[PDB]
């Protein structure tokens, strides 16, 4: 019963190539918000987009459908240390503070 | 009634007081985490428990039960800085990676006087 669904569950990949991280909703959310795990297990927030896309570093995410029926997380120059465990979660009201959130994927970044 | 669900959904205590957080599973959960969302949205972890109890400061989690059906975090002597949304998680399938999240306790800490 996913209302959220993360793709893909787990990817290795080359360091320098890029790839994106997707996340499926079975129904328009207001928001989503991609994390990160620290080592201490914490989901460290990357971004949060209620549409249109965003930027930071390596990284860049859209939330640019009409539909907004997902969103996306591309990782582009992949290093050794961007391996981890990556979340996404979704946000059905404009304000609410409930998050739903996907399955998880875990990256291998190779040398 | 997904796999974990969190109650209460929401509460407001008086500074001072004491209430516990509730993470249900429904089934054995293999160990569960306790988090507490930033300002930023950042989910940080407050305990991983894969059995028994752990206390940090005010704070005090338990997995000890029907072994595995639910945890709790207590939080005694409430400070207006525990206000904020509480979530739990649970793995039962893999291993570390892919866990599964309660919807999130909104806790308001209320000042006294
Ligand atoms: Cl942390
Ligand atoms: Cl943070």
């Known amino acids: 019963?996913?209302?959220?669904?993360?793709?893909?569950?787990?990817?290795?990949?080359?360091?320098?190539?890029?790839?994106?991280?997707?996340?499926?909703?079975?129904?328009?959310?207001?928001?989503?918000?991609?994390?990160?795990?620290?080592?201490?297990?914490?989901?460290?927030?990357?971004?949060?987009?209620?549409?249109?896309?965003?930027?930071?570093?390596?990284?860049?995410?859209?939330?640019?459908?009409?539909?907004?029926?997902?969103?996306?997380?591309?990782?582009?120059?992949?290093?050794?240390?961007?391996?981890?465990?990556?979340?996404?979660?979704?946000?059905?009201?404009?304000?609410?503070?409930?998050?739903?959130?996907?399955?998880?994927?875990?990256?291998?970044?190779?040398? | 009634?997904?796999?974990?669900?969190?109650?209460?959904?929401?509460?407001?205590?008086?500074?001072?007081?004491?209430?516990?957080?509730?993470?249900?599973?429904?089934?054995?959960?293999?160990?569960?985490?306790?988090?507490?969302?930033?300002?930023?949205?950042?989910?940080?972890?407050?305990?991983?428990?894969?059995?028994?109890?752990?206390?940090?400061?005010?704070?005090?989690?338990?997995?000890?039960?029907?072994?595995?059906?639910?945890?709790?975090?207590?939080?005694?002597?409430?400070?207006?800085?525990?206000?904020?949304?509480?979530?739990?998680?649970?793995?039962?399938?893999?291993?570390?990676?892919?866990?599964?999240?309660?919807?999130?306790?909104?806790?308001?800490?209320?000042?006294?006087?």
């Open positions: 129904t328009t959310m207001r928001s």
């Open positions: 987009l209620a549409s249109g």
């Open positions: 998680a649970a793995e039962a399938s893999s291993g570390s990676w892919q866990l599964i």
């Open positions: 979660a979704a946000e059905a009201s404009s304000g609410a503070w409930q998050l739903i």
């Open positions: 089934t054995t959960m293999r160990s």
């Open positions: 428990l894969a059995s028994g």
